[model samples]
Target: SLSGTEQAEMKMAVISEHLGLSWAELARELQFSVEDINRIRVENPNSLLEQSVALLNLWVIREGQNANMENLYTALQSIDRGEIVNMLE
Candidate 1:
């Protein structure tokens, strides 16, 4: 089974994909660079859900041991989309 953080990441990724706004905004708030964000978009042009998962995967790869629910939550809140966080449950 995935760890707590992994489960949380998947939950957020799935829940947020249908959002009208681009997930790139959340990526920027999480400190992902323009290049990385653009790369994710270019590679997943076929599906919004794929782009969503790819973005979270990038965060996981970049942060490695540093990624967690708290920081992701903060990023969601920073974007005034904290309502998505509530949907996680």
Candidate 2:
């Protein structure tokens, strides 16, 4: 069982990867520099989870596609609770 923080980090990584957005790119989107991103990734990783959600929503809007509410909710819930998602259900 992963901890809540770990779960958030995992999903944030997955979402960021899915969008092909690196830490540098995400920092750029947030109007920060790579150095700031590195510090944030270590000192305040939970903040990255919010950034991940924001970026995912941005991508969906820009891509002219609907976000999968259920999937997103499930992934987020995993973060909120810090539990292992079976990925089978």
Candidate 3:
């Protein structure tokens, strides 16, 4: 099983990929420079989870899309509690 932090990171990676943003592009869109993004990824890759979530939230807000707060809350709660699927057999 992945640790809570690892699960968050993986989820972030998946979500970011689904949104079609490379790490660099994601960083740019989030107003962080490439170097900062690289450093964060190297120093604490797990932190990207929060960053990615924030970026998505911002994107949804900007687009006037309704943010599914309930679903987001449930997902985040699940991540924090490590209640996730076992992807590997």
Candidate 4:
């Protein structure tokens, strides 16, 4: 179990590097505190963290060039609600 959680952290770190985004950027994207985000590194990476990463990646690729966390959250929520999910442009 310990090894599994450690792998998850490493994977998240890898994606963070690949995305060229800071931990703070992700925290904003996921509506989390930098402290909380940092906690995930050494703590058990939960499903919420996974979902946050997934949404951030999707946004960065599709509609996160502006990096507006509020609008990003709105857009992601739109997706969840089965709307167009059009944040901007």
- lDDT of every model, 2 decimals: 0.74, 0.45, 0.45, 0.44
lDDT of 1: 0.74
**In terms of lDDT, which candidate is strongest?**
1
Off by over 4 Å in 3: 1-24, 27-46, 65-89
Candidate 3 local lDDT, 1-89, one digit each (tens): 32333344455445644432243464464455566656645654565455565565454555354333334334434444222222210
Residue 54's lDDT within candidate 4 is: 56
Kindly list the per-residue Cα lDDT of model 4 for residues 15-74, writing each as its tens digit: 443332243454455566556656654453555545456544544555434444445335
What are the runs in model 1 whose C-alpha is more than 4 Å off?
1-6, 16-20
lDDT of 1 by residue, 1-89 (tens): 43447676467656557543558888889888899888988998877778778887777788787667778777788888788777874
Q: Which ten residues in a row have the lowest lDDT in candidate 2?
A: 80-89
> Any runs in candidate 2 off by more than 4 Å, and if so which?
1-13, 16-21, 24-46, 66-89
Runs in model 4 lying further than 4 Å from the true structure: 1-46, 64-67, 73-89
lDDT of 2 by residue, 1-89 (tens): 42333354455556554432343454354344566556545654565555545555444454344333344445434444213233312
Candidate 4 Cα deviation (angstroms), residue 34: 29
Task: At residue 82, give the lDDT of candidate 2.
Answer: 19
lDDT of 1 at 1: 40
Q: What is the TM-score of each predicted model, taking all chains together?
A: 0.77, 0.28, 0.30, 0.26
- Ordered by TM-score, highest first, the candidates read 1, 3, 2, 4
Cα error, candidate 2, residue 1 (Å): 32
